[PDB]
Amino acid sequence: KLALSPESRLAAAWDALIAQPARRWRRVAVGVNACVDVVISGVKLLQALGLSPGSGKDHAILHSRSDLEEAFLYFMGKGAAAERFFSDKETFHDIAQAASEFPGAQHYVGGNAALIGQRFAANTDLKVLLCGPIGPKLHELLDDNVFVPPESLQEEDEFHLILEYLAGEEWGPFKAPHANRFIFSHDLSNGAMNMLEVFVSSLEEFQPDLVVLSGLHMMEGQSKELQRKRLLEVVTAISDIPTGIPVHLELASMTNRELMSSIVHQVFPAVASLGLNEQELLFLSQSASGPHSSLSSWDGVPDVGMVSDILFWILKEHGRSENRSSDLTRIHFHTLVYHILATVDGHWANQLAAVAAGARVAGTQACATETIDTNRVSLRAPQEFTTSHLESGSRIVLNPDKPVVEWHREGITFHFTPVLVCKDPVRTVGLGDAISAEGLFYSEARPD
Numbered sequence: 001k002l003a004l005s006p007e008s009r010l011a012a013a014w015d016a017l018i019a020q021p022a023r024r025w026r027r028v029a030v031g032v033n034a035c036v037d038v039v040i041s042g043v044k045l046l047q048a049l050g051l052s053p054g055s056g057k058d059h060a061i062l063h064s065r066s067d068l069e070e071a072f073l074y075f076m077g078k079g080a081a082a083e084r085f086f087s088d089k090e091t092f093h094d095i096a097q098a099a100s101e102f103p104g105a106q107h108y109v110g111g112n113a114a115l116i117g118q119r120f121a122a123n124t125d126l127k128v129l130l131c132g133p134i135g136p137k138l139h140e141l142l143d144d145n146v147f148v149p150p151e152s153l154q155e156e157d158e159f160h161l162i163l164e165y166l167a168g169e170e171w172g173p174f175k176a177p178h179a180n181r182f183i184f185s186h187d188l189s190n191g192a193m194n195m196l197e198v199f200v201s202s203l204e205e206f207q208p209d210l211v212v213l214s215g216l217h218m219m220e221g222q223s224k225e226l227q228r229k230r231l232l233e234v235v236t237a238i239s240d241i242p243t244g245i246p247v248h249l250e251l252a253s254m255t256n257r258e259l260m261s262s263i264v265h266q267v268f269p270a271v272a273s274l275g276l277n278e279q280e281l282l283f284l285s286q287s288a289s290g291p292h293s294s295l296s297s298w299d300g301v302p303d304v305g306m307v308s309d310i311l312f313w314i315l316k317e318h319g320r321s322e323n324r325s326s327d328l329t330r331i332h333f334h335t336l337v338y339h340i341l342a343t344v345d346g347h348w349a350n351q352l353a354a355v356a357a358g359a360r361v362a363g364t365q366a367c368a369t370e371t372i373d374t375n376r377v378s379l380r381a382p383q384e385f386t387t388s389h390l391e392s393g394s395r396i397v398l399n400p401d402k403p404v405v406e407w408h409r410e411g412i413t414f415h416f417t418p419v420l421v422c423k424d425p426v427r428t429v430g431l432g433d434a435i436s437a438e439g440l441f442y443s444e445a446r447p448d
């Protein structure tokens with residue numbers, strides 16, 4: 001033998017440490033955002049619609065094929081990302097149909113809840129119920145083990161059209177300086193959480209062991225009154241689920257502070273578990289009180305100590321307390337180069353294996369391998385780090401043979417592991433959802 005890489009050493013230590021919990025979930029219910037992502041060359045699609053190259057010109061809303069072409073060309077010229085709503089329902093149906101039927105277009109399960117459901121459904125001894133706007137194409141795309149109530153099945157899908165360009169790509173006088181994507185949809189269902197009622201209604205019959213909720217972020221840009229009605233529906237529904245059934249909230253893509261504030265005040269006390277990334281974590285700290293709210297943005301890899309101070313603060317401010325009657329005891333934090341599982345002591349088991357398992361799926365799914373291919377991964381976490389900078393914390397050094405690190409702070413325990421980052425990834429949209437689902441699958445709640 002020669003010396004093995006840090007990455008091979010790390011993946012070997014995971015393989016030994018990872019095992020399912022003693023008591024396993026039988027049934028998990030997941031809702032409510034779901035769609036079909038159609039990934040297609042934008043130039044090819046527009047050409048396929050019979051369009052000649054016009055002018056690049058931004059449009060706030062796309063009402064027409066013209067508007068679509070013009071805004072696409074505008075962003076393709078910048079090599080920049082954008083997202084738009086397309087307002088004409090019937091015209092959108094014809095364009096999405098054209099994109100979805102275009103030879104070589106890729107179709108993917110989309111939506112946090114559907115992606116979570118899909119990951120859980122990979123295990124045959126776990127029964128998954130999924131609600132959301134599920135048409136015939138999404139139903140076909142979903143794993144056969146996923147049960148969708150007939151109530152949650154509809155005639156049309158919610159297509160999200162993802163129009164990609166490559167760096168250097170050309171169409172007439174247009175040339176992309178960077179590779180990016182322009183995305184559009186006509187998705188009122190996910191925007192309004194229109195399947196929340198159907199989801200809530202299906203829980204009693206199904207008797208979930210675990211309920212997972214996502215899609216609140218999608219209400220961003222809707223009536224504040226509509227948002228308030230839906231958050232009350234969430235909280236009411238959860239108070240009707242039998243006591244001691246964990247509820248996980250998977251947080252995502254938030255930019256509105258009124259809404260974020262409201263989710264924290266109302267929904268956080270009603271859930272056992274929360275899942276999120278660096279972007280949402282920092283956004284939370286910026287809204288409310290924040291151990292590092294002052295910082296506008298993370299400057300490269302988020303500092304572990306700074307991250308942990310925010311997670312600590314959330315479980316202290318909003319987590320279960322003798323005064324609080326909050327049910328929140330768990331936060332699965334996942335960023336690119338490390339994941340942390342933070343838990344209020346004595347409510348959860350198997351959290352070493354669980355965080356290890358969340359991290360491992362980030363590698364394997366990114367690379368599209370069954371197991372970790374140690375040639376295609378790279379350890380990118382900091383070699384040493386402080387467990388808090390605010391408080392006086394430990395100085396930890398990474399040991400690839402002992403990758404999962406545990407530390408304690410006032411009845412709250414943290415579980416840290418680095419990620420084996422896929423260097424040549426296929427497609428990493430939806431990775432946080434697969435990470436959170438894996439973390440929960442390998443978690444065990446205890447009696448309330």
Ligand SMILES: Nc1ncnc2c1ncn2[C@@H]1O[C@H](COP(=O)(O)O)[C@@H](O)[C@H]1O
Nearest residue numbers: 277334335336362363366421422431432
């Ligand atoms: N190339 C990669 N290899 C392994 N994990 C990744 C990679 N890229 C992203 N991740 C993780 O996947 C997640 C993407 O989904 P999200 O958290 O929803 O943004 C990030 O949180 C990263 O932690």
